[PDB]
RNA sequence: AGGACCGAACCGACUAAUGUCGAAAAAUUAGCGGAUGACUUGUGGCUGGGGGUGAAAGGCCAAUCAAACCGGGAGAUAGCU
RNA sequence: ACACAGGUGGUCAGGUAGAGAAUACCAAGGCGCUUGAGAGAACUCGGGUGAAGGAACUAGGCAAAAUGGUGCCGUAACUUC
RNA sequence: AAUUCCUUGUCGGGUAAGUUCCGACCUGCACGAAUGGCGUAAUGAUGGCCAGGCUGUCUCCACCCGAGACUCAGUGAAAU
RNA sequence: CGAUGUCGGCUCAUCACAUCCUGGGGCUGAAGUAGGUCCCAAGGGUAUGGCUGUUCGCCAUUUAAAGUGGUACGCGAGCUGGGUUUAGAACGUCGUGAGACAGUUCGGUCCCUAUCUGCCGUGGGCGCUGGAGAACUGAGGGGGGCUGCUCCUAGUACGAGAGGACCGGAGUGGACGCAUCACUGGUGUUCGGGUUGUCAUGCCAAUGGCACUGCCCGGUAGCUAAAUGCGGAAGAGAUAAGUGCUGAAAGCAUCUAAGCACGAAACUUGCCCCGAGAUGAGUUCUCCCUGACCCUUUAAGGGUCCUGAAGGAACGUUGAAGACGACGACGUUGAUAGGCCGGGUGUGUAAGCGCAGCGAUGCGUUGAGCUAACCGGUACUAAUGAACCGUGAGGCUUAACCU
């Protein structure tokens, strides 16, 4: 239950190949404030689908 | 669902009182025996006069079981005591005169016509 | 699923004399004696109803020769002829499985005149 | 192997789930809007809306029964007089969820859940 | 011959007026309609293509919407194929009904099974469980030894191990059909067929006789 | 009355499981034994290395014991690695 | 060795129920154990229930299950009574 | 026999079936009288065997509640 | 020897055939039956207990049979520790004594988070040469292959009888296997009820919290097995041992040398599942894009703007799909999820009141009230318009044909 030979920079680097991070690829803009929010999230200001629903 | 070491109540006036199954018959690696089946038993209790002694190995057939039979409609007849009769080891033709309690109708196997006859009910 | 219920109300028998658990009820059925056909009577106390439409069934406990016998009965079956209620019974539960251990005269239950 | 099961275990045993939902329902009744985790907020939505259904009838028993849940008279008094009969035209959805960002402490999917009026 | 695509509605019982209460399975087969007839001239084999059901027009796609508009049949969920037996000439657009089972006795249902997820070796392959006590230390359901020693030196391929159970296409043959009702387009077959109530399944007549 | 009885605090350590790069260089959980006596516990003293003490196992004597630990003979000697 | 499931002597010791300083729910008072959020696979740890059977398991009834109280009744061989 | 090698001795009992257990027989390899012989009430976390009771020990596992395992965010070893 | 853990047990195997059963034959001191012996055959199958640490054996009872062996006397980074194998203690015994005896008994710590191979699964990338969604092909590979019994033939053949068939057919089983939730059952800490103590909601009533779900009796859905369906084949091809026909060498004879006919669970298909990464990367259907422009050591060249479709992807509601990816359903033109609406189920007569009774408590309202995942309906809440990725007719040669 231990390694018998030290792996390399390749087998280290090749295992890390899928361990990279994705991208959001698209930031939906809202009607009123025109802010770039996440799709299906309220804005950081507070609007959502063109309405200050939160009244933050 | 009778099996090894199962304590049974005898269902005829033969001298037994309490018998233990030691082998189910008819097939290698065979598990449980139901109501139609023949099992080898022993004698754990006896009547003084009797026809059998304590510690006789002989053949039996389960006539009542707590697990119960299933009719062709799905209606299940469940009893309360796993009961059986005695059989003469060779060519069975049962040992006994009477039958106590009700037996079920699945004993119509043409060699248990005697056990049909001596039984009162069903 | 209407499709199953289509196939289920076309098959249930219609008489169905309704009762409750606790009742003493005499069920009559059809002992098919090969090519001959007689009728017997199973009479005891209903322990339980298993009421689900066509799939409904009910138990009955008959004491006979010190051997408690529990037969169930799929009600909508064409071997179960008729149901005749004999003694209306007063029970505060819908299942009566303590009848498997209480014996004798301390097993019999009350009347339900009401 | 979880086919057709409902409810969430929510990493809490049977008392704690029941006690929290008894507890968290009070604040949503009291404050008209609360900010929780989104997986909590969906299962909070299965509890308060039966209580608003109880507050669509002002019987003697429904006082007792909606007091038997949530154990609080002021929560019962918010129903049946203010929150209850006002909602009794729109039979159905009484609470609205909205997704918000991630909790700074441990990256949790925060969300609001709030009554569909919150009128002022 | 050919079989017929359908959908499982569940299981029911049927009482017959002599006694027995057979367990049946409800299969709503729709009007199955042929969309492509393949023949050995320019295809290498002869077979037919069949759709069934109904489909959302906003959820049918432009490569696939044209595939029905060249057949002239109405878009249904999914397509299937059937190997013909050299005496069954059809055409594209002939809606095959449930009248082909007017004298079929045992049909062979093929469908998918209910997925167990990651099964263990005791559920998936019926490995017997080790002893639950007499000192057995954190080993109550493990698969036990898997190989021999240095001389085969490796794990034989085909070893029954842990993994995925269910979610597999399965055929059950010789299942007796008891009702071929055509006004409701239903079919009642003895016993149980592959699971997932509501999922599609392919009925076919018996190869085995 | 009692090295008497059942049983907590208290003292012990039979069995099982866990744990075995541990929560821990000997524990936890569950059960188990004494439990007014040859009882247990605080405080302080006393007994030193071929010596002590030991209801005695070759046990204990600062996570060390068929002869402690520290420095010194001392870079012992090593037909062996 | 650590902000370590360990060790540590004395003192005060409330309400209900109970023989009780046990235990159970509370008081006074003090705390929620310095990572979280989901999912509800295998397999592991701690537990719950189980058809029919009832030690066949197994080195072995290991573990588990089971018994559990008070009051009266009744109680074997043997005995140093 | 805590002692008996041959030996699972032989007889009896217990089990359907008993290399262990109980009772005997002496053919004591190689018991034996304060390195004590032989008994013996009570005692024992003491060894051996049997019987009632109870049961997931097992026939043969099933489902369930939770703490891990798995996913994301944070921190972040190890033997080799 | 700077360590290969050493018996048996358990779990899991798997190969050989010198075959234990089933299959095929020849011989018989082979009448039948049942047997002996030899040849061919490895597809499948191939006991449970008692005693012992035992493998082994012995006994009991089955079975068609209870196969020999190889695999580190297979299997401890899988379990066990009873045996052998440390310290303690004792008997026999040998020794003056320390102690000693695969002589006896009693007791006596079993560590590892898996980098690589391997195997079980499950995906990401690229490829397959215009890009796209489907539906298949089948090279190749895997799974399955067991059999008892009664009955018909038939008391027929056979035989003095006693006994008792061959060949073919029917049915009901034992084991194993796949699937399934209708049935019968288990579970069901998300359903309803009973109840012990205590506490709290100001008090009564009525409730809740804690006590392993506090203890309990029931029990939807889902999930199960003991519940119920289903399988193993037929047939065809080529053969083994074998049996033959015709037939010379060798005027006869002769199953072989030419030629020809049968011949078994083994062999190849037939049954089931995977499968075009089968780089030999396959076929059919279908859908989508037909804008100009500069430059260059002018080459399948590179760059600039105008466009970005089929589609996919991402996000959201999500599922009998799931460890995570993945897979399916659905996104307002909507029933995917929740809520709701009526029902089903389960529990089994709520509360409040009235009446009766000294009271506990019983009656009537009332088969009430409450009901989880289920069934049928309803846009009430939630699934936003957009954005992102994927382009702009697709290499050279030759052939065959339209031009």
Backbone φ, ψ for residue E106 (5° rounding): -125, 120
- Provide the sign of the torsion angle of the four alpha carbons B74, B75, B80, B83, taken in this order: negative
- CB proximity E132–strand F (7 Å threshold): no
Beta bridge partners of E111: E170, E201
| Nearest C-alpha neighbor of C58 from the set B102, B76, E11, E14 | B76
CA distances from D19 to B61, D26, D70 (A): 58, 11, 9
Beta bridge partners of E10: E26
CA distances from C41 to B68, B80, C29, C30, C44 (A): 19, 20, 6, 9, 10
Q: E196 in helix, strand or coil?
A: coil
Backbone φ, ψ for residue E177 (5° rounding): -95, 140
Pairing of strands B7-10, B83-87: parallel
DSSP secondary structure code for residue E8 in this structure: E
B77 interfaces chain C, CB cutoff of 8 Å: yes
The two tokens of residue E107 are: 């049909």
Could you tell me how far CA D27 lies from the centroid of its own chain? 8
The answer to whether the beta carbons of residues D97 and D115 sit under 8 Å apart is no
CA distances from E150 to E143, E147, E159, E160 (A): 20, 10, 17, 20
The answer to whether the beta carbons of residues C81 and C30 sit under 8 Å apart is yes
* CB-neighbour burial class of residue E41 (10 A; exposed 0-12, middle 13-18, buried 19+): exposed
Distance of alpha carbon B94 from alpha carbon B60, whole angstroms: 9
| Nearest C-alpha neighbor of D71 from the set D9, D29, D120 | D29
Nearest to D101 among A41, A48, A53 (CB): A41
| Nearest C-alpha neighbor of E188 from the set E36, E77, E29 | E29
- CB proximity A55–strand H (7 Å threshold): no
| Nearest C-alpha neighbor of E30 from the set E80, E88, E104, E86 | E80
Residues of E in contact with D3 (CB under 8 A): 114
CA distances from B72 to C32, C50, D49, E18, E179 (A): 11, 19, 49, 10, 20
- CB proximity D11–strand G (7 Å threshold): yes
- CB proximity E149–strand I (7 Å threshold): yes
The answer to whether the beta carbons of residues C31 and C38 sit under 8 Å apart is yes
Pairing of strands E47-51, C57-64: unpaired
D104 interfaces chain E, CB cutoff of 8 Å: no
Resolution (A): 3.2
- CB proximity E138–strand F (7 Å threshold): yes
Nearest to C76 among E9, E15, E17 (CB): E15
Pairing of strands C57-64, B76-78: unpaired
In a domain, D3, yes or no: no
Q: B32: which residues sit within 8 A by CB, 6+ positions away?
A: B1, B2, B3, B24
Q: B95 in helix, strand or coil?
A: strand
Distance of alpha carbon E77 from alpha carbon E51, whole angstroms: 7
Could you tell me how far CA E199 lies from the centroid of its own chain? 9
Question: DSSP letters of E157-178?
Answer: TT---SEEES-SEEEEEEEEEE
- CB proximity D96–strand H (7 Å threshold): no
Q: C99: which residues sit within 8 A by CB, 6+ positions away?
A: C45, C47, C61, C68, C107
Q: Which residue of C has its CA nearest to E25?
A: C4
Beta bridge partners of B70: B76
CB atoms within 10 A of CB B41: 27
Distance of alpha carbon B69 from alpha carbon B74, whole angstroms: 9
Residue D59, domain CATH: 3.90.1030.10
CB atoms within 10 A of CB D31: 12
Probe site for chain D from A41, A44, A45, A49 (most D CB atoms < 10 A):
A41
Chains B, C: CB contacts under 8 A, how many?
48
| Nearest C-alpha neighbor of E105 from the set E203, E6, E5 | E203
Distance of alpha carbon A30 from alpha carbon A42, whole angstroms: 9
Nucleotides of F under 7 A from a protein CB: 16-21
Residues of C in contact with E180 (CB under 8 A): none
Q: Inter-chain contact D99–A44, Cβ cutoff 8 Å? A: no
- Provide the sign of the torsion angle of the four alpha carbons B6, B9, B10, B11, taken in this order: negative
DSSP secondary structure code for residue E141 in this structure: S
- CB proximity E138–strand G (7 Å threshold): yes
How many domains does the structure of chain B reveal?
Answer: 1
Residues of A in contact with D112 (CB under 8 A): 42, 54
Backbone φ, ψ for residue D23 (5° rounding): -85, -45
Beta bridge partners of E189: E25, E177
Nearest to C74 among B75, B78, B100 (CB): B75
The two tokens of residue B99 are: 């039958």
Chains A, D: CB contacts under 8 A, how many?
17
- Domain encompassing residue B55: 1-122
E116 interfaces chain D, CB cutoff of 8 Å: yes
Q: Which residue of B has its CA nearest to C79?
A: B73
Distance of alpha carbon C13 from alpha carbon D44, whole angstroms: 45
D3 interfaces chain E, CB cutoff of 8 Å: yes
Distance of alpha carbon B19 from alpha carbon E160, whole angstroms: 43
CB atoms within 10 A of CB B59: 20
- E-strand ranges in chain D read 33-37, 95-102, 109-115
Q: Which residue of D has its CA nearest to A49?
A: D98
Taking the C1' atom of every nucleotide in all shown strands and the CA of E133, the nearest one is: G63
Q: Which residue of C has its CA nearest to B104?
A: C69
| Nearest C-alpha neighbor of A54 from the set E116, C101, D112 | D112
Q: Domain locations in chain E?
A: 1-209
The answer to whether the beta carbons of residues E84 and E173 sit under 8 Å apart is no
The answer to whether the beta carbons of residues B65 and B1 sit under 8 Å apart is yes
| Nearest C-alpha neighbor of B82 from the set C97, C48, C68, C46 | C68
| Nearest C-alpha neighbor of B64 from the set B118, B101, B112 | B101
The answer to whether the beta carbons of residues E10 and C1 sit under 8 Å apart is yes
Q: Which residue of E has its CA nearest to B70?
A: E20
Cite the DSSP H helix spans in A1-56: 9-15
Residues in chain A, overall count: 56
The answer to whether the beta carbons of residues B114 and B107 sit under 8 Å apart is no
Q: C8 in helix, strand or coil?
A: helix
Probe site for chain B from C29, C36, C69 (most B CB atoms < 10 A):
C69
Experimental technique used to determine this entry: cryo-EM
Residues of E in contact with C79 (CB under 8 A): 19
Nucleotides of G under 7 A from a protein CB: 35-45, 51-60, 62-63
Distance of alpha carbon D91 from alpha carbon A25, whole angstroms: 40
Distance of alpha carbon B82 from alpha carbon B84, whole angstroms: 7
The answer to whether the beta carbons of residues C37 and C26 sit under 8 Å apart is no
């Amino acid at each position: 239950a231990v390694q018998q030979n030290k792996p390399t920079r390749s087998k280290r680097g090749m295992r890390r190949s899928h361990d990279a991070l994705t991208a959001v690829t698209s930031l939906s803009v809202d009607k009123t404030s025109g802010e770039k929010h996440l799709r299906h999230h309220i804005t950081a200001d507070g609007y959502y689908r063109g309405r200050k629903v939160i009244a933050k | 669902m009778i099996q090894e070491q199962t304590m049974l109540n005898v269902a005829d006036n033969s001298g037994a009182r309490r018998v233990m199954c030691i082998k189910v018959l008819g097939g290698s690696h065979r598990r449980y025996a139901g109501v139609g089946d023949i099992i080898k038993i022993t004698i754990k209790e006896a009547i003084p006069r009797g026809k059998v002694k304590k510690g006789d190995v002989l053949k039996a057939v389960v006539v009542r079981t707590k697990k119960g039979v299933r009719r062709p409609d799905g209606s299940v007849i469940r009893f309360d005591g796993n009961a059986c009769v005695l059989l003469n080891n060779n060519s069975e033709q049962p040992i006994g005169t009477r039958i106590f309690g009700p037996v079920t109708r699945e004993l119509r196997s043409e060699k248990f016509m005697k056990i049909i006859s001596l039984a009162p009910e069903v | 699923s209407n499709i199953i219920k289509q196939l289920e109300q076309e098959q249930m028998k219609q008489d169905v004399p309704s009762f409750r658990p606790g009742d003493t009820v005499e069920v009559k059925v059809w002992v098919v004696e090969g090519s001959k056909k007689r009728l017997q009577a199973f009479e005891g106390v209903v322990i339980a109803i298993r009421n689900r439409g066509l799939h409904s069934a009910f138990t009955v406990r008959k004491i006979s020769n010190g051997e408690g016998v529990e037969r169930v009965f799929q009600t909508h079956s064409p071997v179960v002829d008729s149901i005749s209620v004999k003694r209306r019974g007063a029970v505060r539960k819908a299942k009566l499985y303590y009848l498997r251990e209480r014996t004798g005269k301390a097993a019999r239950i009350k009347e339900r005149l009401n | 192997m979880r086919h057709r099961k409902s409810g969430r275990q929510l990493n809490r045993n049977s008392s704690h789930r029941q006690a929290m939902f008894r507890n968290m329902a009070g604040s949503l009744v009291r404050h008209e809007i609360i900010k929780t985790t989104l997986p909590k907020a969906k299962e909070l939505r299965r509890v308060v809306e039966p209580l608003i259904t109880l507050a669509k009838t002002d019987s003697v028993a429904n006082r007792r029964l909606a007091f038997a849940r949530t154990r609080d008279n002021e929560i019962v008094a918010k129903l049946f007089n203010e929150l209850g009969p006002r909602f009794a035209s729109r039979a159905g959805g009484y609470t609205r969820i909205l997704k918000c960002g991630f909790r700074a402490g441990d990256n949790a999917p925060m969300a609001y859940i709030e009554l569909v009026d919150r009128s002022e | 011959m050919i079989g017929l695509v359908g959908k499982k509605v569940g299981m029911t019982r049927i009482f017959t007026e002599d006694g027995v209460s057979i367990p049946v399975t409800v299969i709503e087969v729709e009007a199955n309609r042929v969309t492509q007839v393949k023949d050995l001239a320019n295809d290498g084999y002869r077979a037919i293509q069949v759709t069934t059901g109904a489909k959302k027009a906003n959820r049918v796609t432009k490569p696939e919407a044209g595939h029905f508009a060249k057949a002239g049949v109405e878009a249904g969920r999914g397509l299937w194929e059937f190997r013909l037996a050299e005496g069954e000439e059809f055409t594209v657009g002939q809606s095959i009904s449930v009248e082909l089972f007017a004298d079929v006795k045992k049909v062979d249902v093929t469908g998918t099974s209910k997925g167990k997820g990651f099964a263990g070796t005791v559920k998936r392959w019926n490995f017997r469980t080790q002893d639950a006590t007499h000192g057995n230390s954190l080993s109550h359901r493990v698969p036990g030894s898997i190989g021999q020693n240095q001389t085969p030196g490796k794990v034989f391929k085909g070893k029954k191990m842990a993994g995925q159970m269910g979610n597999e296409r399965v055929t059950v043959q010789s299942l007796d059909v008891v009702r071929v009702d055509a006004e409701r387009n239903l079919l009642l077959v003895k016993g149980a067929v592959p699971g997932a109530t509501g999922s599609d399944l392919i009925v076919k007549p018996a190869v085995k006789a």
